[PDB]
């Protein structure tokens, strides 16, 4: 990755430089210099001595300050300093006031702005993930939770006595669709995060599952098995009208949207072993799009439509892999066991998924260039179905 210097911020209620460093490394785009190896610890743009950094192959340095305010809040400021072609030039800088609970958010804001200034890619460090935890609690063992993308600041959205599956975020980040077995069978519901209001979407006979909101906010795709097998359906969210997208006796599920809100990728057993297909929601037959491997399933298409990640079987093993949608090129990304249910960061730089790490008590992160892999912090249960929020 791109070498970069991230210096401890001048003060401590939280280690802001540590957060920036972790964020930049998580993206796979950067290789922040290990803290022990730093040549100096400048607290301001003026204290930067650019030669010590260029000597290490580093052409950008992040410095910052954290100052406490009389009202009990904190000022967090950062400055991005060029240590390459224009040594000492401030490329980017910002300063803001936050109370203690938002110090992590302050760090992620610095990460986002530094990231974007250097890569030209919008940052996703202030985003969230939704997931389901099966705890050992007896009365309500299933919880739909939300946390920051790195596992911090987790909160409970819904608790249930019965299994929950496959949460999906609305594009404005304000709602979560999910599958619940609370009534004694499957139902698809949409829950408004702010007030806890639950809208009933579908509870047809047999299975109701695998929801996905269109990027434009107008439609919800999902699968129903009422006809005798899983088929894809789309609901117009304004009216509640439902249209059948696929028909026939194969199983078609796990829909994910293309950026145009008109096409879906999805998994079908039409060819035998699961493969990924594309279909226009308005008409026409599905087209198979995965030809490499022996099995490919549970796709997520990137927000720019350039590629998709999915669970792919190659050389006998299943891992998270990425398929370029223009070239057809495929790259295996993860190396862990029992890799499943991948979900892309809204900038396409990172994938969150589930594996055997910690016997399923943790979620995993892998950068989409395959350069960096990490476990999220452990939860107090079995964690499944991660869903990466849109930009917030």
């Amino acid at each position: 990755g791109r070498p970069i210097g991230v210096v401890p911020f001048q003060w401590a209620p939280e280690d802001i430089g540590g957060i920036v460093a972790a964020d930049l490394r998580n993206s796979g785009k950067f290789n922040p210099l290990d803290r022990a190896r730093l040549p100096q610890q400048p607290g301001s743009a003026q204290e930067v001595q650019p030669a010590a950094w260029s000597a290490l192959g580093i052409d950008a340095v992040v410095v910052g300050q954290v100052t406490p305010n009389p009202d009990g809040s904190y000022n967090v400021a950062y400055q991005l300093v060029d240590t390459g072609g224009a040594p000492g030039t401030v490329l980017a800088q910002n300063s803001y006031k936050v109370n203690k609970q938002w110090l992590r958010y302050a760090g992620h804001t610095a990460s986002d702005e530094v990231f974007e200034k250097l890569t030209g890619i919008k940052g996703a460090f202030r985003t969230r993930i939704a997931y389901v935890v099966q705890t050992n609690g007896g009365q309500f063992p299933y919880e739909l939770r939300v946390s920051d993308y790195d596992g911090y600041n987790q909160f409970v959205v819904h608790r249930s006595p019965q299994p929950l599956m496959s949460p999906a975020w609305s594009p404005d980040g304000s709602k979560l669709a999910y599958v619940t077995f609370e009534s004694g069978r499957s139902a698809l519901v949409i829950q408004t995060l702010a007030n806890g209001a639950v809208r009933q979407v579908a509870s047809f006979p047999r299975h109701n599952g695998a929801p996905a909101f269109s990027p434009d906010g107008s439609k919800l795709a999902f699968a129903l098995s009422k006809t005798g097998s899983l088929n894809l359906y789309v609901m117009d969210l304004a009216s509640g009208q439902i249209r059948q997208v696929t028909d026939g006796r194969s199983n078609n599920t796990e829909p994910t949207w293309f950026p145009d809100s008109q096409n879906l990728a999805f998994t079908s057993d039409q060819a035998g072993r699961p493969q990924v297909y594309k279909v226009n929601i308005n008409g026409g037959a599905p087209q198979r799009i995965t030809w490499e491997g022996s099995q490919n399933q549970d796709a997520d298409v990137s927000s720019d439509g350039k590629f998709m990640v999915m669970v792919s079987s190659n050389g006998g093993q299943q891992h998270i892999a990425k398929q370029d949608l223009a070239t057809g090129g495929v790259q295996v990304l993860s190396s862990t066991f029992l890799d499943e249910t991948p979900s892309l960061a809204p900038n396409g730089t990172m994938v969150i998924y589930s594996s055997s790490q910690g016997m399923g008590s943790v979620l995993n992160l892998v950068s989409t260039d395959g350069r960096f892999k990490a476990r999220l912090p452990a939860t107090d249960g079995q964690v499944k179905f991660p869903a990466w929020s849109p930009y917030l």
């Binding site: 299994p163 695998a210 199983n251 796990e254």
Partner: peptide, 15 residues
Amino acid sequence: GASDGSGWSSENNPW
């Protein structure tokens, strides 16, 4: 218990 009955998807007996 809870399953989509596909025999293969992420919602096939996940729990």
